[PDB]
Design a binder for this molecule. Structure first.
Ligand SMILES: Nc1nc2c(ncn2[C@@H]2O[C@H](COP(=O)(O)OP(=O)(O)OP(=O)(O)O)[C@@H](O)[C@H]2O)c(=O)[nH]1
Lengths: 782, 804
């Protein structure tokens, strides 16, 4: 809920400052100027009888000369009573009258509240030389009370030969540099009427300024976005290619764009906005460019990039020929692998995702004669854009240049050592600036403190479990601080569950150490965690609380009374299961946890873990009956793929991986070999053809490739571990940054560094344990 | 302690934030950056063991070409092996080379850590790019070579091995003689001393070489005798002359009593000081000389009224632009963009307004503030009655200074505060009480604007005790208690929640207190619970903590020592609610206390030679010395009737009267360095607070001193408005123990003399504090001081010490 940008981490909305030019009134006594909202300077005067403050009057302003409106408005206040209040700084002026705010809070810069004669001529006589930012009638001045809808805005809009409608009402859409939308409509009116020879660019029709509104209407071009072409045409599955002839299809895009980009550099026009929402590929691979809103008609000036898409912003000032060659660089690298999203934080990002590409095509098997071609075309693009310096302290995130293969277990020995150091590093850059949480985390879980999730001590348990999995600073003092902090705030939290709730930290007060303190905490608090109805899912609900309770019962340290009625609670809960499966979970796309409604962790297959867990230590028939329904009703939402596979279908997106995909059910079948019949054990063949893809963008255990490999290489009845680790290691090298002697992992929507079990350091640290230790140690098995 | 400026209150070194133009170089493929302690950024190779203790390299820079040296030694030291660190913001470059930061941290912008086998190698190609740069002089560091290159981390370099009144980082404001004729010097050193409109010391110092040469011939200006360059260090010499500063001259020649000076004739004396200034400030504002800085420590009045303005080291030589005032004075600075000729009408104007009623100090916090020190000077000299014919002359001649001044539009957030413009005279009852009706708004309106922008405390305080949140003194519990007793005096807000979080963390942080004492320690927080309206918590905390509090206490005075502990002990015994066996024990503890006291009082409190305003640098006084012991013995003689305890009163007042001197007015006054102190807590009001009402015990030997102190505590004007160090105690102490009923002289003189101290904020009468660039609500100089002193005459005993 709290989106803000900081160099490295995310932070909640308490970090930003207001270092701007302030506004100032110079008014006499019997008026207050006391601030109360940090927006206005709030004034109710002295010696009053204040009215009920009904219908209000309003005055608006423009950025061109508003050091002269306020001073003339302030000299009206010497005569008569008025609630005079203006805005604080120019930053609130830009935000109030600019890009994305509502229509109600736009145009307001100075305030009068109507008791009076409702008219005064000397304010009308010192003004009406200023007119602009109208708000959508009693007098003159600024007072505001045809030759023929995909993105609404208060500034303008885009509305559906059929023609599109690009418009801009006057004096709006102010940026940090003072330019407007109608100031760039004329920029398109120059920049596309200067070149009408080409067929890959529309025709300008300014039809009329009805009222006074700047319009620019261009016809609908034909083509597809290049992202959809990549995800519909990249060799994800290994046989979808038409016996090669795709890296030659790359040569159409990597020749047409180069042969077109040098020809508008001879017309003194530079487009300066080059991302993947502009290049539209027609049928029979014809290209088309759009959105010429940022065209500067100069070469010797230097502009730092202001508005772009995520991925392709320039770095610390360059000549504007380079702000169109940088796009042709990082889009011709985009076709090779789809990995450019991190490049807003990491500069010169495409070296490691271009080195591994030749290794990818030689492993899949392509002819070298076709391959040695695009590697020279990309080498030609290094001549145009020069090396620039990395400033603004996003500069430590350094991509690797050398990558070596895997030949022994010592590769896994040093991988863990170079992964654990990048947890001390990302703590040492978080503790020095903030103190609300204690470890950095992905932005949606930015205020959570409990359970196996976006957390504070689950990541510390993941830190020590792999550190004990490997052999040989300040673990114990931070250990003592977080253990005391957890037990201090164990109350006053209003959520219950295993991954997010209260009994999760009961599990890690057991497993983290401190065996006794866990059992008086359990005997004190388990019943008032339990009894209060609520939900049923393993992420947050009664199955999460109950299963770690039976883990405690089967461990062997419990009194007889608790071992009686806790087993009575699970005997009750499985009988309340009986026939109705829609109670716990549902039988659109996102990457945040709470709006998902299916999978292993968020869905039906979590209850299957409990039903398979109870059968050992019980051995009775009803817990066998519940298990196969719990596996079968998870597979309702699976559709047969194009080539003999099964995936989770949520919207247009296709879902691999552990949390909400085929991998969790594959792992759950792979564990329970003995109780499952031959009809359900034969589904390994279809799911193994699903969980072996060559590319999946997210790196985490809860999201992406680590969940794909930890489902395959875990049980298998075979003690082979080296081939179980080698594939995940060699195909997780393309998702890593390098900070000092160590690695970090950027989370989903990657512009960050994170530590969590929901796509960060700790997720791969659990998965690499679960490869060799064969338990999946963050899910209760006993 | 902890002082920092802010538009209104003071605060500690937290509210500073930062804004500057930043820094920082590149890093190709083998490096890392860390944010160490918010004034360095640090780059080092990814894994290398280097060296301990051997050698490092410090690089300074210059403010004009600062960035162009970072990208000159970034890439010349990325090659080979050099790890380094440097400063992060420009405003810390203003501080590291500056004027207030000492010698130890100076000339340091970039710090480098080469390895021991490369010390010749790391600089031989690093220096060659730097030959067109230069920087500050070498302090707290060593010399290596030309260009800006010159400890612990976690070789070839062996070869190269009259008086002073101010010390600063600029170089000195020293005083010497020619190789004679007496010379006042200034000094500077390379590229040092900057502001936020940063210009160097050798720029402002050379910006008077024309201003003292244009005038030169005149008889009231310095004459430059020597000027030149012995080194790059700049020596400017102007001739020393005799005289007295005007701020000392005002206190030397003002009527402080009605009987100080005969012949009358003081408004005729201030005629030659307000004509010579006004024609002098037109004589040199024609030949292009504009002196921006003018204050009371500048004009040296000579024998028989002769002004001698010096130190013209802020001179601007043309007036066709509007500038802001850059360096201020304690009380005098311009306001919002005026020409350099009209920074001598908000200049020399307010200097000659110090000759009438000497309070101009809070003009930095209140715009204008000569209305109150001009309106209520005419009243003073009509009540004192020198001559009426001089009054209109001086008023018109000051109005001409007002006439030449421009009316600047007032704009800041230091502009809520106007000076007050109407003053009544009280004779009736309701005119006394209306000041109480709106002085309470001066306590309410200073509460919001401290808590809403800073949350580390609860109430604004004077900066001497800022992190001392316990006691009767600078505190939190005593402040809200002083409010309640004054509010009960007037007839007819939500202070119940306020007092419950006062009571809660009055005792929550009781354990985390390293000091014990009556006014600033543990036991004061105990018995404010008893006098604030809770009777049982006082007893429980009293037993359970006060027994170890009396165990661990060390000192024997009554501020922070043993005396007030057993004093409030006998207070609790006299009211006698819960004590019994503990009361018998406390009486026993008093028995070994007094008999150990009676042997030699010299080694419990010292029987003052330091000029200070600090609570912990005092030796003699009522609270701060021996009269508190006589308060305890005076009360111990009352309850029991025991005849041993009368012998302590005579010994205490015999020891306290050896310090006071006799002067031309035959006034017995406190001696503290060179300063006479008629005040409640550190002087002559203390013994008058003690001696009377103990006149039913003592008969003849200690009632002949009452009339001398009664006459000696009758000053007309003193500057501080406080209880323990200000005026308000002097109108309490003079009639506090009156055996004849008298209230109008106790509530009319004090509220006629405390009209000259008040700002407005908004419909309020807010008091300022010690060194009053601030509004404070504390008990020494603030809201609680006047809230206790007015109640004191009304309830006729006292409300700072517990009565037995
Ligand atoms: N007795 C005497 N003292 C002088 C004379 N000329 C200058 N001074 C000294 O100069 C000092 C001026 O002090 P300030 O008002 O602080 O000015 P400053 O020395 O430039 O220091 P700043 O506050 O930074 O401006 C006085 O304290 C005097 O001691 C003189 O002719 N006679």
């Amino acid at each position: 809920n709290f989106n803000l940008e900081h160099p490295f981490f995310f932070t909640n909305n308490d970090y930003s400052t207001d270092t701007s030019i302030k506004y100032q009134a110079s008014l006499p006594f019997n008026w207050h100027e006391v601030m109360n909202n940090d927006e206005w300077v709030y004034q109710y005067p002295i010696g009053k009888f204040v009215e009920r403050q009904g219908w209000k009057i309003h005055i608006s302003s423009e950025y061109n000369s508003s050091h002269e409106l306020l001073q003339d408005v302030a000299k009206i206040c010497h005569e008569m009573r008025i609630p005079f209040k203006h805005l604080s700084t120019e930053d609130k002026f830009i935000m109030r009258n600019g890009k994305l705010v509502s229509r109600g809070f736009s145009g307001k810069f100075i305030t009068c509240y109507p008791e009076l004669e409702s008219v005064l001529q000397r304010l009308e006589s010192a003004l009406k030389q200023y007119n602009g930012p109208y708000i959508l009638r009693w007098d003159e001045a600024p007072i505001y009370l045809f030759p023929f809808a995909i993105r609404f805005s208060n500034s303008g809009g885009i509305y559906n030969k059929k023609i599109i409608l690009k418009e801009a009402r006057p004096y709006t859409g102010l940026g940090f540099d003072g330019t407007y939308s109608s100031e760039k409509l004329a920029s398109e009116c120059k920049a596309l009427k200067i070149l009408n020879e080409w067929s890959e660019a529309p025709k300008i029709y300014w039809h009329g300024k009805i009222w006074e509104h700047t319009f620019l209407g261009i016809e609908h071009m034909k083509g597809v976005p290049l992202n959809r072409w990549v995800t519909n045409n990249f060799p994800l599955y290994e046989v979808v290619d038409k016996t090669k002839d795709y890296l030659l299809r790359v040569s159409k895009i990597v020749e047409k764009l180069i042969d077109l980009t040098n020809k508008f550099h001879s017309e003194n026009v530079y487009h300066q906005d080059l991302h993947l929402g502009n290049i539209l590929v027609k049928d029979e691979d014809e290209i088309s460019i759009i959105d010429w809103e940022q065209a500067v008609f100069s070469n010797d000036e230097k502009v730092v990039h202001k508005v772009a898409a995520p991925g392709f912003r320039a770095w610390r000032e360059t000549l504007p020929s380079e702000i169109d060659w940088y796009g042709i660089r990082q889009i011709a690298h985009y076709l090779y692998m789809p990995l450019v999203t991190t490049s807003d934080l990491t500069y010169n990002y495409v070296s490691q995702t271009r080195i591994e590409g030749k290794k990818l095509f030689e492993s899949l098997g392509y002819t070298r004669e076709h391959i040695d071609y695009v590697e020279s075309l990309l080498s030609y693009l290094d001549s145009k854009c020069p090396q620039i310096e990395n400033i603004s302290r996003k500069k430590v995130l350094k991509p690797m240049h050398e990558i070596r293969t895997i030949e022994s277990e010592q590769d896994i020995q040093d991988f863990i050592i170079k992964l654990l150091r990048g947890f001390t590093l990302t703590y040492g850059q978080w503790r020095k600036e903030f103190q609300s949480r204690f470890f950095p985390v992905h932005y949606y879980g930015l205020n959570f403190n409990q359970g196996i999730a976006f957390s504070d001590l689950a990541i510390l348990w993941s830190y020590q479990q792999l550190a004990k999995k490997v052999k040989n600073d300040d673990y114990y003092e931070i250990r003592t601080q977080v253990i005391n902090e957890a037990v201090n705030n164990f109350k006053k939290s209003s959520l219950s569950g295993l991954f997010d709730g209260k009994i999760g930290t009961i599990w890690l007060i057991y497993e983290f150490g401190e065996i006794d303190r866990a059992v008086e905490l359990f005997t004190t608090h388990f019943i008032e965690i339990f009894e209060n109805s609520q939900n049923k899912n393993l992420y947050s609900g009664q199955a999460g609380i109950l299963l770690v309770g039976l883990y405690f019962l089967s461990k062997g340290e419990i009194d007889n009374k608790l071992g009686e009625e806790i087993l009575i609670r699970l005997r009750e809960y499985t009988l309340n299961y009986i026939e109705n499966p829609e109670t716990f979970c549902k039988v659109v796309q996102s990457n945040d946890p709470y709006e998902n409604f299916g999978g292993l962790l968020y869905g039906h297959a979590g209850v299957a873990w409990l039903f398979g867990e109870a059968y050992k230590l019980t051995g009775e028939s009803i817990y066998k009956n519940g298990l196969e329904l719990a596996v079968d009703k998870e597979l309702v939402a699976y559709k047969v793929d194009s080539n003999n596979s099964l995936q989770y279908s949520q919207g247009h997106r296709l879902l691999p991986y552990l949390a909400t995909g085929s991998a969790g059910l594959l792992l759950l079948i792979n564990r329970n070999k003995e109780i499952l019949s031959s009809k359900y054990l034969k589904y390994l063949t279809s799911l193994e053809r699903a969980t072996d893809v060559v590319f999946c963008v997210l790196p985490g255990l809860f999201n992406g490739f680590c969940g794909l490999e930890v489902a395959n290489n875990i049980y298998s009845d075979i003690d082979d571990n080296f081939s179980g680790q080698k594939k995940l290691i060699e195909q997780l090298y393309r998702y890593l940054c390098v900070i000092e002697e160590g690695f970090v992992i950027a989370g989903d929507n990657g512009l960050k560094i994170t530590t969590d079990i929901a796509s960060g350091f700790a997720g791969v640290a659990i998965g690499l344990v679960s490869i060799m230790d064969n338990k999946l140690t963050i899910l209760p098995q006993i």
